Amino acid sequence: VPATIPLTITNNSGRAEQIHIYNLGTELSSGRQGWADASGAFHPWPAGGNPPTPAPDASIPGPAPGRSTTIQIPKFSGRIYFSYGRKMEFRLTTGGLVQPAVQNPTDPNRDILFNWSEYTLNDSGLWINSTQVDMFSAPYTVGVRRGDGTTLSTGKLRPGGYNGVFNALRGQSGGWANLIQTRSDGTVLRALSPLYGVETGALPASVMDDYINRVWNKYTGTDLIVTPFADRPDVRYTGRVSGGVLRFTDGSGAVVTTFQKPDASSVFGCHRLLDAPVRGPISRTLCAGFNRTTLLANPHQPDRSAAGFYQEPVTNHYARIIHAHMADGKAYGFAFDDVGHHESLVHDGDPRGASLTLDPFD
Numbered sequence: 419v420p421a422t423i424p425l426t427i428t429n430n431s432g433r434a435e436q437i438h439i440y441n442l443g444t445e446l447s448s449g450r451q452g453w454a455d456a457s458g459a460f461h462p463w464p465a466g467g468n469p470p471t472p473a474p475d476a477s478i479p480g481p482a483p484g485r486s487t488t489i490q491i492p493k494f495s496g497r498i499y500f501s502y503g504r505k506m507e508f509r510l511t512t513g514g515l516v517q518p519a520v521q522n523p524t525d526p527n528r529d530i531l532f533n534w535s536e537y538t539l540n541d542s543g544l545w546i547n548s549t550q551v552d553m554f555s556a557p558y559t560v561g562v563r564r565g566d567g568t569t570l571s572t573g574k575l576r577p578g579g580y581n582g583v584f585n586a587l588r589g590q591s592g593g594w595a596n597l598i599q600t601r602s603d604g605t606v607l608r609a610l611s612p613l614y615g616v617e618t619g620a621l622p623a624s625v626m627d628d629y630i631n632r633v634w635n636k637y638t639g640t641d642l643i644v645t646p647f648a649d650r651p652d653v654r655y656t657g658r659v660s661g662g663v664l665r666f667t668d669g670s671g672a673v674v675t676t677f678q679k680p681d682a683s684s685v686f687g688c689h690r691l692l693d694a695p696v697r698g699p700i701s702r703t704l705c706a707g708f709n710r711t712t713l714l715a716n717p718h719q720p721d722r723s724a725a726g727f728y729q730e731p732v733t734n735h736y737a738r739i740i741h742a743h744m745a746d747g748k749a750y751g752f753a754f755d756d757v758g759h760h761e762s763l764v765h766d767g768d769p770r771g772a773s774l775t776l777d778p779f780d
Contacts, residue, residue, distance in 0.1 A: 419539070419541055419542075419544075419768065419769065421458070421492060421493065422490035422493075423539065423544065423769055423770065423771050424488050424489070424490055424491075424771045424772070425489050425491045425498070425772045425773065425774060426488050426771065426772070426773045426774070427439060427480060427481050427486060427488070427489065427498075427500075427773075427776070428485070428486040428773070428775045428776065429480065429481040429483050429484065429485060429776050430483075430484075430775055430776060430777055430778060431483065431556075431776045431777065431779070432483070432778045432779065433483065433502060433779070434483065435502040435531075436479070436480070436502075436503060437479070437480025437500055437502065438478070438480060438500065438501045439477065439478040439480040439487075439498065439500055440453065440477055440478070440497075440499040440500075440501075440506065441453055441454040441476075441478070441491065441497075441498055442476060442496050442497055442499065442508070443494050443495050443496015443497060444494065444495050445460045445462075445492070445493070445494060446494060446495070446539075446540055446541075448460075448462075451463050451514040451515055453476035454489075454490075454491070454492055454494060455478060456478050456488075456489045456490070457489075457490055458492045459492075461476070463515060464510070465510070466509070466510025466511045466512055466513075466514065467510065467511065467512065468511060468512050470509035470510055470511040470516050471509060472507070472508075472509060472510070473508040473510050473515070475505065476508070477505055480500055480776075491537070493540050493541070494537075494538075494539055495537070495540070496536075496537065497535065498535045498537065499532060499533070499534040500532060500533060500534070500556070500774075501530055501531065501532035502530075502531040502532070504530045504531075506530060506532060509526075520599070520608070520610075521617055521618055529601070529607070531555070531607060532555070532556065533553075533555045533556040533558060534549075535547060535549070535560050536549055537560075537772070542767060543765060543766050543767040543768060543769055544562055544765065544766055544772060545764075545765045546560045546561075546562060546764060546772055547560065547572075547573075547750060547761070547762060547764075548560055548572055548750065548763075549750040549762070550611065550749055550750055550751055551611060551750050551751075551752060551753055552610075552614065553608045553611060553614070554608060554609045554611070554736070554740060555607065555608035555609075556608075556776070557579075557776075557777040558573055558774060558775060558776055558777055559571050559573045559574040559773075559775040560572060560774055561764060561772065561773035561775075562764045562765065562773075563766075563770040563771040563772070563773075564770065565766060565767065565768030565769065565770060570764040570766070571764065571773065572746055572748055572764050573744075574744070574745045574777065575743055575745065575777065576743055576744070576745050577780060578780055579744070579745075579780065580743075580778070580779050580780050581779075581780065582743050583609070583739050583740055583743050584598060584606050586735075586739045586742075586743075587609055587735070587736065587739060590735045590739075592732070593620045593622070593625070594612075594615070594621070594736070596615070596619075597610045597614075597615045597620050597621075597736065611751075612682070612734060612736050613686040613687035613752075615736075616682050616683045616686060616687075622682065623681045623682050623683065624682065625682045625732065626680075626681070626682050626685055628732065629708075629711060629714070629730060629732055629733075630679055630681075630685075630708070631679075632714055633713045634659050634662075634664070637658060637659045637664060637717075638658070638659040640658075640717065641656050641658055641717065642656070642657035642658070642713070642719065643657075643717060643719065644657060644666065644700050644703050644704070644719050644720075645718070645719070645720075646699035646702065646703045646720070647699060653669075654669070655667065655668055655674065655675075655696075657677075662678075662679065663676050663677065663678060664676065664677040666700055668696070674697070674700075675696060675697040677692070677701075678691050679691070680692050680708065685705065685708045685709060685734075686709070686734065686752060688701075688702070688705040688709075688752060688753040688754050692704060692705050692708070702754045703719050703757060704719070705752070705753070705754045705757075706721075706752075706754045706757035706758065707719050707720065709733075709734040709751070709752045709755075710724075710727040710733070710734070710737075711728065711729065711732075711733040711734075712726050712727060714730075715729075720758055721758055723758075724758065727741075736751060737749070737751030737755070746762070747760070748760055748762040749761070750762055750763070
């Protein structure tokens with residue numbers, strides 16, 4: 419893999435605003451945090467602080483409507499951000515770049531229309547994604563041109579899919595409507611993922627309690643079988659609830675990890691009581707089963723197809739709705755949507771180039 423590959427950025431947004439691009443992350447060779455310019459040259463961030471202090475302007479001018487621009491991506495792990503009209507405000511803490519947190523009303527980027535793609539380019543190739551783990555906002559498609567010349571892309575919404583997602587969220591009772599952030603003059607900005615919905619009070623900590631209790635009851639009287647390694651189908655862990663705790667045993671008979679009854683943040687964020695650091699692979703499987711609400715219906719996890727996903731009246735509706743509106747049915751609707759390979763990521767080991775397309779607000 420060469421030192422850089424070209425990323426072609428195309429503006430199909432249909433919008434008139436100028437575009438600002440940021441390539442922010444960590445340099446592979448040095449491990450230092452900073453940004454890369456259009457030529458691929460790396461610029462380490464200056465030292466930050468506690469409290470965090472302002473970052474220098476790392477913007478690169480993006481493509482005008484109907485046109486593309488090219489930047490060179492170096493061996494780097496990080497994010498390509500794009501914003502419409504306004505520049506983003508980034509800050510630097512002791513340890514480096516502060517991530518935006520627009521679930522906070524006071525975040526300096528709260529009112530800016532922006533999104534990002536997550537990528538890694540290293541000696542083993544390129545990984546680039548379309549993600550909705552934190553929010554659903556300005557749409558985009560990412561792609562890779564593989565060593566053999568073939569292309570893969572993902573992230574593309576169906577026609578009418580952008581407004582389709584918002585309309586479906588607004589109509590989902592229970593608090594999902596309060597996930598939507600809307601310029602007080604009505605125009606939609608983004609919808610927060612339900613993890614951040616719990617944080618903001620849009621959804622209650624108890625929203626999944628009825629379903630979770632049903633799962634705990636079921637697996638008090640029968641085994642939950644988890645085979646969490648896609649390439650090692652014979653490695654199985656057996657879960658059973660006793661004393662209110664879901665306990666997993668391995669082939670040898672040892673209890674290897676235990677789970678307390680989870681809450682909404684734990685499920686929607688795949689963390690806390692569902693932390694995934696042998697526990698990690700098991701937890702990741704359970705996380706996906708709770709978000710897709712397949713745990714009750716299928717005692718042999720993970721699921722082998724998506725046919726039974728999202729059928730319960732209370733489920734991760736944000737994820738359900740986004741997957742339904744993606745052209746390829748894939749999305750990063752929650753952190754472990756890669757369970758069963760349903761996530762919007764493309765990869766190649768010997769990439770020739772990559773693409774980011776800013777899509778229309780359709």
